[PDB]
Design a protein around this nucleic acid. Structure first.
Lengths: 123, 122, 94, 112, 251
RNA sequence: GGGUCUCUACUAGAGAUCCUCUGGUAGGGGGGCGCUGUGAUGGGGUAGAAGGUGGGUCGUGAGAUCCACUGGACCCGUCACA
RNA sequence: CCUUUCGUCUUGAAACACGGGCCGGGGAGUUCACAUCAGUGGCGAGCUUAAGGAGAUUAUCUCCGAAGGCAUAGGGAAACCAAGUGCCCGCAGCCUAGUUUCUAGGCGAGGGGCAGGGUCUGUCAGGGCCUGAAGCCACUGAUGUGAGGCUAGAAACCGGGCG
RNA sequence: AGCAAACUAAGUACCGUGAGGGAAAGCUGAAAAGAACCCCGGAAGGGGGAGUGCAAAGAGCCUGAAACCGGGUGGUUAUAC
RNA sequence: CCCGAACGGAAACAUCUUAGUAGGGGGAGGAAAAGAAAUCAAUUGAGAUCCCCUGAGUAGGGGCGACCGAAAGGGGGACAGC
RNA sequence: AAGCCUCCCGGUGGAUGGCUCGGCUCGGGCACCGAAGAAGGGCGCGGCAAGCAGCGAAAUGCUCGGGUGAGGCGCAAG
């Protein structure tokens, strides 16, 4: 539990955006990463003042990787039958209700999860 | 032995010839009419009395005053809507949303067609 | 070839260029069976002319004394059949 | 890719005899190079009432003189009836693990 | 070892299935045979062989500049090339493409055996999706089931033996599918239901049960992987007659 | 990457432990993301869908998912295939 | 405080080298045949059906159809002739003794080296090829070749017509 | 995209003396109920107030992105990239 | 049924191939054409024509280069004869 | 003030999404017309009729049988 901000809070993350994302709007509006390959490219050569390349040394600690910022394990629930298959219990999961479920089924879906003691993100 | 393609089914109902357009106007008879006529459905003509089973005016009963045989809709007297100036216009309801309450038995060729369709004895 | 791929030809291309010999138009077609393979038809006299076999070859050896009728046989086959106790009859056709 | 070949390899490795660990290693060869043996070679290099362990398939070329017990992954159907007709026995690699004499067998030969 | 049932679901016998039904279930082998039979029913598609080429457009050359590129253009405007509007496809589909996947006949018959065993394993039947309350799998019925002629009294049999829960599962039709398939006659997508294997075709039950949602009827000497393992997933709920087992025992 | 072990109807997953290695073009090799359709499915969702605009969170990343508004009828998760 | 304009040919180029005003949509290793390798599956001294025939719930499915092909014997231009076994090392593994801890000793499938055997040639030694019993079929991928063949691009040459 | 051609007339319009070459372009709504009447304007499916409809991107009609332009919010600007 | 190219490939090119193709002229039909041995093959056998799977990239042609290329026989579909 | 960056609202624009009485490929049928004037073309015909389709000075249709049963005067609502 106390090992969640020792790796995250001090190390503000890089964005890893494609080259020339700020000169052309056709490249800047995608907001995604693409590997540099030009023979003279400067992010490929890793020159000074040029926004790091993507590397495997940037991964996160395996014991906190992929967790909800509340410290639990997120589960995306699309039906009421997904609640009955709760593993272990309410101690280690946070429920993510699907966005497309209509308002009438949501009322019954939230009631079912509340009595089980589960924690809901988008309640 | 006809095609199951949705486009081939729709091209038939939008280009149906004059002698076959009676199929678009078929409607169910009331329970009392089928006691004394021995058939379950019939096509609608002007002068029949008709009652609605579906729509925002369900239960409304009147008489047929117009037909649109190309689309399969009927106009009932007293079921109107007024325009901007105030002159009323008819509300068209499909023939599959109505049930026939009484017939106009005055053609003598409609009547023996009903008998040919196995009315019981006469 | 002979211009720039002739480095391949002199090493991997023997017989690529030229003529050698002739074909006989009247070569006799012979269907040969060995002793090692003969132990199956196809699973005491054996008449091999019936199954379309012409010559009997040395092969390995048999396991039982048999009488074989073939058009032709090899010298080793003739001597190895005698050792088991068999006998070879050279009948060109049954 | 076979479900039963994978579960057989995982249980051979758990065995505590170097004979069975070598069989599991040999069964992991590429399929194009998997081992096999014919009847004629088992006959040449064995004595009566031996135990032959083949890490592949036993095929039916040649003849068999003496009775032997042969343990293999699979048998050709002509090859299976050659062995039984001469008084031998056949087992699968699955059953050979559990057999009580095969717990502490003696005079065992590994062939291919 | 399974029991035989009468039309009311009562047990009246006890038989032993052939040793085919004890073969291990091999999902890799069943997928080989299913994908081969599936591709035999595909039709050849292709494009117009001349689409995009019905023109005499040609390159203008160089030094024009305004003929901006050495592309082919017919008195000014673009034509014929794969990157232009109204041009030809670079690699259009053709009827020459090979569609079918062959399997050996001996490999096929083993794949059918492996699928017949998956219908005798209650774990594979429950893991495929089917709902049933019968304690015995597979269901073996007496041969009087051949003579049922009305689709109403087939449903009475399925209720007694405990299979109608699979009919309700099917009858919740998965409505309208997603995509351009519905434009082409493929409007719905329905679950698969129980399978019935009978001694011979031409029996009355072949026609009477042909309308029940999800079910299929096939003779014991015609059945293959596409019936036992639809989609490539073994373990379809199956009903056999007493004399369909004997016909299967001879293969 | 390699050695040594555990569990699982396993073309793969989930783990424990010990040693060592970490620039890269041409190029060779291993794993994954995304798009459209087909056979299945514990499977589901919808007049409250798809799409659009702005913003949260997860992942080195390709990407995934949620929130508010817009919109008015269709669309997705998993397994396999093309 | 640190940081020259992207892609590219090129030793470098790279910029006073070329293509580059903005945004949206489209846009380039694909198909078949043969061959050879590979990952897996079926059968195995054999493997496999093609065209097709019969049935059926009728382009799926089931049964039949080995014709032919590849492999099983090779050498020689041809007439013609025609093998497959015995010595030594020895990995894994097994046994025995000590488990002191183990090439200590035996047995050693697969593997290596010397020979042997078939055939052509030489007047002997020699010289060439073969012989120590595993292949066929299927799916997928890679590469070669042939077809437009990753996409675009010539100046030209020919046939028949129109001025 | 699919045939060059899903539409007020496709080998149609249009180009060439001729042989010949060869386009573009789909979508209101369930129903026209397609906006009566009043003020402005020369007129205008023009402006404003109304009214119809579940809902007016209401005739230039489904949804309605970006480039581009105008108005506004929050920072900031005439000693210096 | 007659007349009849070049581009390209051979890493040039002329025999060759491309190809009796593209094209030109004449004549039909719902099909055309072929069709009842002055045939094949080999110890005295088969038995009109046509189409499919083969034989087979075999025999064989060729600046013996690039390349070109059968028939008989076997399995079938229909199977007449005047 | 010329302005500069960001978001909101509007304009202009017509992408994205959804739709489809149009195409495309296979199977299966069926298969000649013409001097008794063909195929192809040109001009006409509607109350107001320009185009397409239909028709030919008997010209948006004439006669006789059969089917059908209440509306009809094509695309196209005056």
């Amino acid at each position: 539990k106390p090992a969640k901000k020792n790796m995250k809070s001090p190390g503000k993350a890089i964005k890893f955006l494609r080259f020339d994302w700020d000169k052309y709007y056709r490249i800047g509006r995608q907001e995604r990463w693409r590997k540099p390959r030009g023979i003279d490219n400067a992010i490929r050569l890793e020159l000074k003042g040029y926004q790091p390349k993507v590397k495997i040394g940037y991964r996160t600690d395996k014991q906190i990787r992929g967790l909800h910022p509340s410290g639990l394990r997120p589960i995306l629930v699309k039906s009421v039958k997904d609640l009955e298959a709760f593993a272990k219990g309410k101690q280690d999961v946070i429920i993510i209700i699907s966005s497309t479920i209509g308002l009438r089924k949501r009322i019954e879906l939230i009631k079912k999860a509340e009595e089980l003691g589960l924690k809901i993100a988008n309640r | 032995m006809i095609s199951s393609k949705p486009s081939k089914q729709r091209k038939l109902v939008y280009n149906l010839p004059n002698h076959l357009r009676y199929k678009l106007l078929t409607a169910r008879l009331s329970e009392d009419l089928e006691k004394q006529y021995g058939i379950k459905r019939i096509s609608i003509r002007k002068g029949d009395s008709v009652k609605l089973m579906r729509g925002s005016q369900v239960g409304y009963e009147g008489k047929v005053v117009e037909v649109d045989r190309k689309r399969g809709r009927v106009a009932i007297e007293g079921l109107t809507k007024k325009k901007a100036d105030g002159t009323p216009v008819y509300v068209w309801v499909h023939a599959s949303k109505v049930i026939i309450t009484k017939l106009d038995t005055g053609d003598k060729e409609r009547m023996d067609a009903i008998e040919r369709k196995r009315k019981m004895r006469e | 070839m002979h211009k720039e791929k002739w480095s391949w030809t002199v090493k991997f291309g023997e017989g690529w260029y030229g003529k050698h010999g002739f074909r006989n138009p009247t070569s006799k077609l012979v269907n040969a069976i060995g002793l090692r393979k003969l132990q199956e038809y196809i699973d005491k006299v054996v008449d091999l002319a019936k199954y379309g076999y012409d010559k009997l070859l040395g092969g390995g050896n048999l396991r039982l004394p048999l009488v074989i009728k073939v058009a032709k046989a090899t010298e080793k086959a003739k001597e190895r059949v005698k050792e088991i106790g068999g006998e070879i009859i050279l009948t060109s056709s049954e | 890719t076979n479900i039963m070949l994978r579960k057989l390899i995982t249980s051979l490795k758990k065995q505590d005899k170097a004979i069975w660990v070598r069989v599991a290693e040999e069964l992991e060869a590429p399929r194009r190079k998997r081992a096999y043996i014919n009847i004629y070679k088992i006959n040449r290099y064995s004595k009566a009432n031996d135990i032959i362990v083949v890490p592949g398939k036993v095929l039916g070329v040649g003849n068999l003189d003496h009775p032997v017990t042969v343990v293999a992954l699979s048998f050709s159907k002509p090859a299976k009836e050659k062995i039984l007709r001469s008084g031998g026995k056949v087992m699968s690699l699955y059953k050979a693990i559990q057999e009580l004499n095969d717990f502490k067998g003696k005079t065992v030969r590994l062939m291919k | 070892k399974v029991s035989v049932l009468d039309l009311k679901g009562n047990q009246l016998e006890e038989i032993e299935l052939p040793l085919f039904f004890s073969y291990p279930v091999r999902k890799d082998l069943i997928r080989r045979v299913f994908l081969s039979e599936f591709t035999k029913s595909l039709q050849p598609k292709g494009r117009d062989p001349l689409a995009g080429k019905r023109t005499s457009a040609l390159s203008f050359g160089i030094n024009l500049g305004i003929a901006r590129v050495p592309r082919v253009k017919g008195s000014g405007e673009a034509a014929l090339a794969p990157n232009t509007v109204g041009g030809r496809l670079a690699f259009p589909p053709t009827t020459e493409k090979r569609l079918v996947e062959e399997v050996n006949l001996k490999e096929k018959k083993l794949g059918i055996i492996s699928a017949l065993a998956a219908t005798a394993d209650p774990n594979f039947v429950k893991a495929r999706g089917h709902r049933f309350t019968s304690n015995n799998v597979p269901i073996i019925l007496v041969d009087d089931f051949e003579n049922i002629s009305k689709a109403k009294e087939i449903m009475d049999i399925l209720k007694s033996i405990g299979v109608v829960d699979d009919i309700k599962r099917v009858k919740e039709s998965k409505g309208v599918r997603a995509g351009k398939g519905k434009m082409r006659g493929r409007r719905y997508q329905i679950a698969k239901g129980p399978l019935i294997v009978v001694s011979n075709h031409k029996s009355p039950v072949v026609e009477s049960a042909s309308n029940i949602p999800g079910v299929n009827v096939v003779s014991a000497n015609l059945v293959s992987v596409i019936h036992l393992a639809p989609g490539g997933h073994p373990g379809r709920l199956t009903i056999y007659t007493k004399s369909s087992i004997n016909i299967l025992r001879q293969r």
